[PDB]
């Protein structure tokens, strides 16, 4: 979830 969110960011 993390590495999603600070890819989409
Ligand atoms: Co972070």
Do not use: I, R, S
């Amino acid at each position: 979830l993390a590495e999603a969110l600070h890819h989409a960011l």
